[PDB]
Design a binder for this molecule. Structure first.
Ligand SMILES: Cc1cc2nc3c(=O)[nH]c(=O)nc-3n(C[C@H](O)[C@H](O)[C@H](O)COP(=O)(O)OP(=O)(O)OC[C@H]3O[C@@H](n4cnc5c(N)ncnc54)[C@H](O)[C@@H]3O)c2cc1C
Length: 409
C-alpha cells in the first residue's frame, strides 16, 4: 500500500505553502500532494488580474518552479482527486479507486462555484475564473469574438473580472443583488467609489438586481434569466458569488463544522491527525471578536499552512496573524488590513475624487480595519493601529495631513 508521512490534498495556495512550510521547519518524512488540476501549484489572484489580461505567463504565476519541488522532496499526484477518507484506518481513497495511507493529513481543497444553469447542465462559456484552464477558455472565447459579458456578483472577483473584460473592449454588465457592490466586505464609501469608477469605465452596473438562472442553447450560454423575469443576453457569464467549501468527504467521515470544516488554532479538525487549511476551514478569529469565520484569502491560506506544518513538526505556534487582503481593478490598487465586518463607524481619510484615499473602520471607538485605495502608507501604518485596537478620535483619523503612526499612544 502506497503511504506517505504527510498527505496534502489540494495543490493550491494552502497545499503548496503547506509543503514549503513542512520542509522549512525541518520535516523529513515523505510528503505527497494530490491535486485535481493538471499543472503544478500556481497563484490564483492573477486569474482575474494580470494572467487574464495577458501581462503574465503561466511560468510567472507558479508558486514555485518545477525544480523546487524536486529539491524539497515534495511528491505530487496531479490530475487526481481524493474522493473519500477513512480517518480510523488513516486512509484516503482516490478518484481511480486506489488508496493512499497517511500519518497526518492536510485538507487544502478550497471551494467550488455554485451551479446556476436553468436546466442544470454545464454551459460554455460560463466561468468562475477559478482555474488556469477556465481562464484560458475565456481568453480563447474572447479572441474568437465573444462580446457580451454578464458578471454575477459585486464582490472583488466580480469587479476585477469586469475590469479586465473592459480592457478586452467587450460589453460588461455587472449584477449585484445587494443594495451595493462589496456589501459583505466594505463600507458605503468604498462601494460608491468603485460603482462610480466602474460605470465611468463603461460597465453597466446594476444593484438590487436579482437573478434566476443561466440560459443556454444546450451547448453554450445565451442569456441570464432574471427573477423579474427578464432575460439579459450574454455570450460570457462570470460567476462571482459565494463558493462552496470542498469539504464533503470530511463531513461524511464525521468531521464537525457548519460552514466548511471547523479547526482549532493549530488547524486541527475534529478528526484525529487531519488538518484543514485555506478557504475550506472555519476558525475562531481574534479580529472577529472570537467568532468562527471562514476567511478566503492568500494571507489566510499561507498562515494556516504555516500553523499546520509547525504543529506537524512538533514546534506549534498558534495562528494569530492579522488578516489582510488586496484587489487590483483598473489603475486602482486596494490594500485592506483587519476585518471591517460589524464596524459601527467608517471614517473617510482623504478625498475619493483624487482616487487615492483610505477608510478607517471603528467599532466601539477602536480601529478594526482599513481600506486603502492607492494609499500604501496608510495600509502599512494602519496595521499597527488595527493590532493595537487603537482608540483614536475619528476627528484625528480623518486628517490625511497627519500620518497614522503619529496617532498611537
Ligand atoms: C479569481 C480569483 C482571484 C483571487 N484574488 C485574490 C486576491 O487578489 N487576494 C487574495 O488574498 N485572495 C484572492 N483570491 C482568493 C485566494 O486565491 C484563495 O483564498 C486561495 O486560493 C485559498 O487557498 P486554498 O488552498 O484553500 O484554495 P485553492 O488555492 O483554490 O486550492 C484548492 C485546490 O484544491 C483542489 N481540489 C479541490 N477538491 C479536491 C479534491 N477532492 N482532491 C484534490 N484536490 C482538490 C482544487 O482544484 C484547487 O486547485 C482569489 C481567488 C480567485 C478565484
Amino acid at each position: 500500500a502506497e503511504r506517505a508521512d504527510v498527505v496534502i490534498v489540494g495543490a493550491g495556495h494552502g497545499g503548496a505553502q503547506a509543503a514549503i512550510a513542512l520542509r522549512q521547519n525541518g520535516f523529513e518524512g515523505r510528503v505527497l500532494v494530490i491535486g485535481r488540476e493538471p499543472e503544478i501549484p500556481y497563484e490564483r489572484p492573477p486569474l482575474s488580474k494580470e494572467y487574464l489580461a495577458r501581462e503574465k505567463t503561466f511560468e510567472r504565476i507558479c508558486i514555485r518552479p518545477a525544480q523546487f519541488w524536486e529539491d524539497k522532496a515534495v511528491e505530487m499526484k496531479l490530475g487526481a482527486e481524493v474522493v473519500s477518507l477513512d480517518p480510523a484506518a488513516h486512509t484516503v481513497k482516490l478518484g481511480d479507486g486506489s488508496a493512499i495511507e497517511y500519518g497526518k493529513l492536510i485538507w487544502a481543497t478550497g471551494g467550488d462555484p455554485r451551479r446556476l444553469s436553468c436546466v442544470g447542465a454545464d454551459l460554455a462559456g460560463v466561468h468562475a475564473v477559478r482555474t488556469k484552464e477556465d481562464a484560458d477558455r475565456l481568453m480563447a472565447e474572447l479572441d474568437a469574438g465573444a462580446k457580451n459579458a454578464v458578471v454575477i456578483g459585486g464582490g472583488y472577483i466580480g469587479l476585477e473580472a469586469a475590469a479586465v473584460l473592459t480592457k478586452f473592449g467587450v460589453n460588461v454588465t455587472l449584477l449585484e443583488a445587494l443594495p451595493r457592490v462589496l456589501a459583505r466586505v466594505a463600507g458605503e464609501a468604498l462601494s460608491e467609489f468603485y460603482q462610480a469608477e466602474h460605470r465611468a469605465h463603461g460597465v453597466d452596473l446594476r444593484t438590487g438586481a436579482a437573478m434566476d438562472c443561466i440560459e443556454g442553447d444546450g451547448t453554450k450560454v445565451t442569456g441570464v434569466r432574471m427573477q423579474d423575469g427578464s432575460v439579459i443576453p450574454a455570450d460570457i457569464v462570470i460567476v462571482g458569488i459565494g463558493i462552496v467549501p470542498c469539504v464533503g468527504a470530511l463531513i461524511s467521515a464525521g468531521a464537525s463544522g457548519g460552514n466548511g470544516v471547523d479547526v482549532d488554532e493549530f488547524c486541527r479538525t475534529s478528526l484525529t491527525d487531519v488538518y484543514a487549511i485555506g478557504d475550506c476551514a472555519a476558525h475562531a478569529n481574534d479580529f472577529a471578536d472570537g467568532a468562527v469565520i471562514r476567511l478566503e484569502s492568500v494571507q489566510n491560506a499561507n498562515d494556516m499552512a504555516t500553523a499546520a506544518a509547525k504543529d506537524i513538526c512538533g514546534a506549534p505556534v498558534p495562528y494569530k496573524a492579522t488578516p489582510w487582503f488586496w484587489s487590483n481593478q483598473y489603475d486602482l490598487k486596494l490594500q485592506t488590513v483587519g476585518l471591517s465586518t460589524g464596524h459601527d463607524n467608517a471614517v473617510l481619510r482623504g478625498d475619493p475624487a483624487t482616487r487615492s484615499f483610505s477608510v478607517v473602520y471603528l467599532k466601539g471607538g477602536k480601529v478594526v480595519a482599513l481600506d486603502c485605495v492607492n494609499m500604501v502608507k496608510d495600509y502599512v501604518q494602519g496595521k499597527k493601529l488595527v493590532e493595537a485596537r487603537a482608540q483614536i478620535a475619528p476627528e484625528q483619523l480623518a486628517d490625511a495631513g497627519v500620518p497614522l503612526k503619529e496617532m498611537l499612544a
